[model samples]
Target chain A: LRLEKARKIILEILNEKGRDALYDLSGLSGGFLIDEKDKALLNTYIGSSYFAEKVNEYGLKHLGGDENDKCVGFNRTSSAILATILALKPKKVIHYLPELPGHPSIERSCKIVNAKYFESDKVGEILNKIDKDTLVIITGSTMDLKVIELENFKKVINTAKNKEAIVFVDDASGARVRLLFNQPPALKLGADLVVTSTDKLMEGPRGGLLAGKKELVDKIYIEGTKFGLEAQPPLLAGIYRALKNFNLERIRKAFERAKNFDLSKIEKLNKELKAIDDNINIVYERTPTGFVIKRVYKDDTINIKKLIEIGFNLLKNYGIITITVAGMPGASKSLRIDLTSRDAERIDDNYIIKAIVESIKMAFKS
Target chain B: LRLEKARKIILEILNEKGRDALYDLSGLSGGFLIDEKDKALLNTYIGSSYFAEKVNEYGLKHLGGDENDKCVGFNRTSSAILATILALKPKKVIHYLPELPGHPSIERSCKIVNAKYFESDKVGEILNKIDKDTLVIITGSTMDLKVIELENFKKVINTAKNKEAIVFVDDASGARVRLLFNQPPALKLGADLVVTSTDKLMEGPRGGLLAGKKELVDKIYIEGTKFGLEAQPPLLAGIYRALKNFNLERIRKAFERAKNFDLSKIEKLNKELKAIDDNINIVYERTPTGFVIKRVYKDDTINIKKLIEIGFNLLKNYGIITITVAGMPGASKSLRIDLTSRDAERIDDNYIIKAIVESIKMAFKS
Candidate 1:
């Protein structure tokens, strides 16, 4: 286990886990857990001016180091992303991938404004492909989307600089990747702005953060009021505490210990006989203290109603659950499963794999 | 409007017109431009309980009676409907028609709750069609959809009562129906409750009105507060004043004038069309201020992208605007065009008819 995992685990142990107590496999995924200390602070007045300043301090330090960098706090990362995108009134919006994580506010905003959304398979080649009309290109809405890396995001800044374009990174999940991979924040990578869900990597409240060049960030703040995109005081306070006590090295260790626990199991399952879902493929994604099991139907065009039933059945029989999956929107054919130390306590890797395999077979015996 | 022309026009006029100043075919349907009265009310603290109480009084007076009926005010009519449905934990929600006006929040709530939703064509036969476990039904999101009629709703209440099912009439348009027709609000027709957008037929703000059997409406108020479903003081005040000034005679005249204006024009266009959309059919509907010009694609299974363009183009050519004209959701083959006296001040029936005919021809010239 690495030190980053160790730091997070100790915080979890001392403060308790699951700020959203019901979110373990039983509750569908919306957000990650929080430290008890942060949760307790939320028990009082969290929306005070003092609270905003405290929370702003962490965001400013982490992603706003440059004198030109500015910041804004919102209730959800998607909110900040939406307000900024809408305010820009860009002629066109390039979606790095149509498979970007499901974000309610972002999706509706894009459609309401009739943003021209297109997908790109070329991730590493993105910055090199910048066009003049693109208002913004969104990247990193998912933790395991595979299309985002700090390096590509870095070039997006320089390319957009010459083209009158705005570059955005929806770093809702990739924040943790920074500590895990010894990389920098997407902002440091030259993204004109980064909108991150603090609750993801920082064990904070379900709040959003935006940081970027001073002028751009300030504009997002002003435009946000029209949409009422400000975070509540309690959420601000909780995020402040989470970031304040956060330690990279120790938390990284705990994260790996839990992540390896599932990786070892998935490795064996991958080696086992193929008994279920010939039309399906298993993709294991290692993350801090857990691994996401992406159960993709070979035909992404097929319906995932049954695939989701298989997941729910796993919980009924083996305490397994998934998040941000079971919908291609119109297609409805993909399932994304996440297992973390928060919900991985009693899960046996062998049985977990076996149950998932059998569940798919039972659901798709055809 | 054929024979139906007389009924809805009376309701449309006394109720006044353009309560939502921008709901014309040209402006696009989303929100309204409030009047001086409404704009002023919103200037004060609109979130106070006094404001809510004042607003609640009007909704209560119109839809409430017998001490059994109660009311709750919300920011949007759909919110009240969705919250009521969720709190009821109904097993199934039958769509009276697939093309029912789209309400984003209401639809999503039903989905998240896993409510079974289906549609029917013969709304008149719905009572006999009720089955065990059929928990709810939605009707009248519009005043013009082919499925809605006066007597049919009269029976929906009794059928639902006998079957222990909850029948909700989303009468966002038909409050004027009660005043003009001397009938009860949809609730008096035996509905468990009625969710009306006062902003439409009743000439008010963009707020929601829910009035039903006391116990049911009271429960929604309790549950709604948990979900933050209450409206603000200013909105409450505005709605209260809008309802207070409600004079059945004046509104009836205005609604008749607007309906006659649009109706006479649509009749000429209906008889003269050829090069427009061959896949389309035309129907006239009567309402408070104007008769509806429902230009439906013959096949409810086609794309309405072209049909929508036909509408937007009208504003440019003839100063005509429309709504409820395109998309039946899963069936995008319809377009509903609404007209009113406030903005219908200088509408030239000849140009209006010609513009629609010529615009459709231009778009569907293929």
Candidate 2:
């Protein structure tokens, strides 16, 4: 009734303002009445007609795609993975460590379908042990060395493909990381299904999306409908809007700004951290798209509680929100900061770099 | 987003007019705060929780229990039904003719559990066929005399109490009809479980409710949680609001109005119709709760469409939305109307009597 009343009020407002409220008017009018204001609002609220449109506009700019490529479904990264699992109906599903947390819904769904789950650092050993009836679910969040070894990953995919098994890549975070580096497309790199969370790097509503072969997508769609899980109208509307608003030229300029700051500002902080602690280490990796700064330390000897307390206080003082790295044990941690076009402009990199240096210094000094 | 903006605008407007702003609140300070006027506006958009309290209050009056009786899971009609079904896990479920016409949603659910359905008129025959293993599902719509006279309608519950077969009554419509006349409570009389669409006759937001023996309700709760078909919080709020608004005194007054009108209005229409058409016959029977007026026709040669056309147009011209009677082959050609309290106030006996007489005359003349 709340939604019903909202609809009535919206209609009444439109009537009073003499606004031409229309839906699906192209077919009705034999053309279209193009209104920039209405178009902007509609695009923001509704997803684009085709998933390929969004992929080509935003994703393809960073990660390349072909004419044959078509995006499968709309969901969050976790949901997309679940959709793929449901579609394939594989006998066994294996997860590579470290696992992405805050995915209880996906876990529950997997339990309902009686799917087997596994986690281990020995990917090659695990892959060799499982039969072709199993699916190997790889995460993009694994260390760079593991991710860069595409040949070894391809070997696993080939093994699964040979045994009539499916390979699903949890590339939700990869899309974000791709902003810094021109990583190989997960779908093209032998992943039967590539799932990503659009909201993280895309600056869209919190939702997931999937891209794969059309035949696979069809199977997923049928199963999704059978499970009575339909895409919410509002989410679809928001996706449509974000797709239209994306511009590659503007994005490239923003990335250039981010690169300048990373070289000058963030580099200074890394040097400062190494000067303070002998055990602390930092590595900078530059890719075609962007750069990555990985901080490592002897976490086993450090008090994690003290580090977290200092970090929290520093974040509070600077008014900066820090995203936590999941599944990592002890005091050892890494922060993945997004270098997006909008964030590059609004955020002062010097302030964040100073905050990170000061927080670490304060923790070690204590 | 629109509603949020509206709230901000309203708060600004109030401040401009020299009124206290919502931000002036003391307790729960530093958190979100809205003025009384803004709170009222929020209620309009989000629905009032105060309304739910009213429904709960009213439910307790008729149900005769403590304040806790109103607090149940889901609070929506379908959700309540689902909860009840989960609790009972009835072997065989039956539905009356002209089932709630939606899509495959209901049928798909039944198929998942392998439940059977039967028409309302064929209840007696279906009951005769069903054994101790079969579970009978009697709907609220099955208020007619013949349907009630079905074999083992009363005995099914007793048998279930001792052995296997049980009777579950979805007394959605029956509850409203019972307001017309005093009768033995359906739950108390025979049914093992009874469910109601609280929003329909209850005048609440669209929702369903279930009430029965404590043991059965407890079982339903367990299954409902397991199934993950939970109701929205706002709907539960609406159900509570409706219960508070309901009163037996108001219901009794409505019954009195219907009884008084029957003597002066409906009886005259029956007499007039019998005199004009030899084939047209009206059968008045005492129902479990009230009276049912059924029209039976013998002349197969007579045009039923002509009679309906006249009736429809006459009511339309006079701005009266009368009951719509379906013209199905082999089924009785009849119009059924419920004389609710709202209907009684809308028109007098003379108006309806004149409309029926003139409408029939106009049809024959044409």
Candidate 3:
């Protein structure tokens, strides 16, 4: 099955079994965190929230801002990023990332405003690139949890200190991980603006928390609202509840433990099943917190398609949800099994391993 | 209380008393219609709906289209219109409305694409302006319930039949109102595309239903989805339920009746109100279906501000809602209390008149 078909099956399962019966193994649940009370507020006209105001306050605090700071929530990190770019209308946008590739939206937003775009993984290069008309975007952390070095981050900020360049940080996952790594939040480091994802490494809804200088944020808020990028009240409430409930202890426990499924079993099963006969090989890579499964061989087209089919089987037969099966098109095809999700506690490691193998076998047969 | 303050108070009330205590009399309660079951389905991740697929089907049929036609749902009519214009990139857009000015989004969308735009209340002008590169937009009904003359609509269609210009109808309220006037739906009348508001004159969620030729709609859908203009699944279900629940007979009752609040009392209240001494005149307009209140004399800004403050008082004290109190910025400043709403059934005419006079007095005092 392709990604669209896989998505269709997920909805079908949800329709039949209800959301409760399905396990969110995807770890990308994002804004699916609303409860019964939030659902009651869902029946609002043009949706407003007391919690949205509180969310703004909490976001300001979380980003290390004072009363003078302003905050706004968006439908997603990209929407926030797009709004900020549109508001600034920078002549040149320079993006500094911990990794070579930044989020797809960072470049796309720049393109929309017809800004000259430049990106680099190297820190010293950005220092030389600083100028007044530049809007420098820093990726606090990559999708792979590759956090930028604190010293390098400081260099970018201190360099921008001498120039009129605006320092904006895309700290989607970095919002939580940087705290664990003893790195200061973007605002505390004197960045002009910072936008982080509520869903990433946090049990909040799928939304963006943009907090920064009052003047800049207010302008971006107006621009975003024009295009329907603002998060609804129920989502804001979810963001508030998630922010209040966030515990470093719980995150640390999930972060440190590596009681993940056996990776060797996947290699053993791949050989026994003779899957490479179809010009494909199921390969596994162990990460700090979880594991990633890749299809190694020729033809990326079929490889990704087959992996998604495997993901669909896992979801259909085992009630498992994963990024590959239900993620947006153009999302990473590698099947990532994030054991840090809340679902991990309810699910056994062996069960996940068994499900993966069974799903692979089913895909091969198809 | 200006529009923003009034909006804040409404949110505050909903937070304090819940949505049940407030009565939506704002003929503009677009998409505020969801039930207990729909609310349960609200807890979705990226929200998909089996109902959404069905919404497309129902919309196609409602617009008098066959399997060859296509349909898409949007967050709002403007979003859909904007998407269509962006996708088409038409050289010139000529909007023919029943009234002089069209919906704000129509003009704004034209500006975004840098298209030459011309709008006319006269049907003959549109016929004279048609060209292959031109996109012709017809307003099926103005927001004030000004349904276009059927013969005029046919004239525009027949004229377009001789030209390559695409005929797109903005049938927001007209989607239902036209049927009452014995005028065929826009799609059935040979228009290339038609869009309607699910909420206006229909008990659906606030969303836009765009139905048209498959090729044109497919392009527009891609454009809209790129910018998050699509409605969520819960909204789609609401649209489905609203469409299913729609009855021409019930609409006929609301359409033919004028059991509206006394306007003479408003004139008498104005005399006793001493409100005109404040340099503002309280004017009441009786429509076929309901009553409308406008503030005349003096500055447009203060007049609008005072009307919204009056609307706020009604909501705060009488649990009544109106467009001026809860509508978006740049929406009509005239307070519209649509008596055709479901809220009208539970409320007494004398009670409404009392609420209006009392609210006006409270505003005058403040």
Candidate 4:
């Protein structure tokens, strides 16, 4: 129903602007345009107040209808996040629960900016390392979580006040994971800045977003222009549409049900794989989407790389697609099997189980 | 003529691929696609011998065909340049001659990367300042010649061999002026690497290019993957077409004629304004294209902003578009009057003289 509504609006847009132009919904990002026919119907808003207004409507801003909140868009998340900290020029930066694929980049940046990197999993270690020259950055996750109590949040804020430190929370995985808990985002949880990548959890185009108090984010904008981390206007329009279109309660219900169904499928696959080979083990007790299966070896000498390739390649015969995570350090521990609704929509559960089982059998070679 | 040629190829691409599709040339810096169309009639060399062959054909290479020099493509030139030195993790980044638009960004990156910023006007200052712990970065200008001798090139190379210092020359202006000289680009001039922006001096889409030794340039490809500077394939093809389509001698003649003729129009405009006020001056003794006029002021307390605005508005009334540079620090010292070819093509010398004199007369009045 949401897709239908969005498609209808898209049709109305095309009727006026891209009448002869074709569209591919499979195109994950960018709205359509044929400028010779008309101004790019989406990006024309860049010079207009509406694009700014639509961006503002997404938040109860620290700069609401005064609408002073500014945007500095970039190709992806890292550099803008990098730029924000650069503007701060924090003497020592403490990263709280930072690792989520790009943790190494933070260290490199700190090494670049001459800031020392101190990471801790919780508030106590964060405070333990804090000095007047420190800046504290944190993340909030639902899947791999470090829950912030209202008390602890207050304590960090209190410590920051006394120490001349600031807090920036990175929610690169949009705040979709917060649906089950009914929790506030990092900004509401008391952060000076919070950034989310629109593409990952919001289904928008590739971009980095920092939303919080206006004055703090405005500094990043000044630096980002020099950094050349600008956004595509039509892509910004895609973000505007995505922001207005998403209905939270509907998404919560859809994802809740989708996860339950996925958990069941994963459990079934777990049992099936166990019966086939003791060398293979179910890796997930619970997961938001799909789960992983690890290859066990009695001898330490068993090559994790060879076992992963054998299983990965064997699945190709069955026309089932799976990621090959041998490049990850924990190759022997498990291969990460992430199945979204898109994957499930294409491949049935029974088919997945059969292919996975057959692959394991071929992988271990008895 | 080159625009027409390039536009024709663009149309051919549109007729085949975007026939039922859409386009937005004004949509900020990236050229995007829906990806169901041809991967490109040229960049199919993505893996072919042709990609390497074409790259080699550019000139001398530190990374020859056997080495298959790597490339880093992005929306523009600055950040990629920033990314290169950042990845190199140079202890000290000395500026040999960095006068590109994004000069401010280099200082910001140095702040972030903890690299020292050194400045000097000529090669003597650069060679004198070099130590073993330096990564020497420089720029090579064509008509604005920052010439490096074969002796000095080897001296820096010799210094680099001892100190582990390396050289990278940024050619922000794509050697268009080089047509007359038939000189080697920076790489052939004995520098370790060189980079050029394609959109400017080269009539290409928005992108950055570097050609030189494979190992140094290849380091950027791996780092660019991390920096997210990868070029879109079709966009890369657009760059390739622009490169091959360029006839150096043809451009040299066209620019030489345009600049000379444009200079006279500027002088004529200059004379007319000076006759009216005795305060205006032609700014450029030599320029690549178009011309600039800066107004002179008699007393310290004069309102340059208002005068600049009056002349700017009068030109508008005459339906002539011009940039009003009132915000620059020396706005009172001069008003910048610039001309593009479209201005040159549309408005002849008589029309230009009439409008500017009339605009000045009106500007000086109540």
- lDDT top scorer: 3
Fnat per candidate:
0.00, 0.00, 0.08, 0.13
Q: What is candidate 3's lDDT per residue for A1-366, written digit by digit as tens?
A: 223565466567768876555666556554344454444444434345455667877888778887778877776687788778878889998899987866677676676567889999998788899999999999998656679999999989888888978999989889888887888889999899999988787777667889999898999988776655666554576688778777767777776655434677788877876643656577788776678887743587777778877877888998777777754347766888776676666677788889998898877763
Q: Which of 2 and 4 is ahead in DockQ? A: 4
Compared with the real two-chain complex, what DockQ does model 2 have?
A: 0.04
What C-alpha lDDT values do all the predictions have? 0.54, 0.45, 0.75, 0.50
Q: What does candidate 2's lDDT look like per residue over A155-192, in tens digits?
A: 76777777777777677656445434556777777777
Residue-level lDDT of model 2, residues B323-351, one tens digit each, is 22223334333443344322333566566
For all the models shown, what interface RMSD does each have? 21.4, 19.7, 4.7, 12.0
Query: Over all chains combined, what TM-score does candidate 1 have?
Result: 0.39
Candidate 3 chain A: 10-residue stretch with minimal lDDT = A38-47
Model 1 residue B61 CA deviation (Å) reads: 18
Better of 2 and 3 by DockQ: 3
Q: RMSD to native for every prediction?
A: 23.6, 15.3, 6.2, 10.6
Model 2 chain B poorest 10 in a row by lDDT = B24-33
**How many residue pairs collide in each prediction?**
52, 29, 5, 7
- Per-residue lDDT tens digits for candidate 4, residues A62-127, read 212234444444445666666776677777887776343435656655765678988766678888
Question: How is the predicted docking of candidate 3 categorized under the CAPRI scheme?
Answer: incorrect
**Candidate 1: misplaced stretches above 4 Å?**
A1-46, A97-111, A123-133, A145-151, A259-366, B1-366
Score residue B169 of candidate 2 by CA lDDT.
Answer: 64
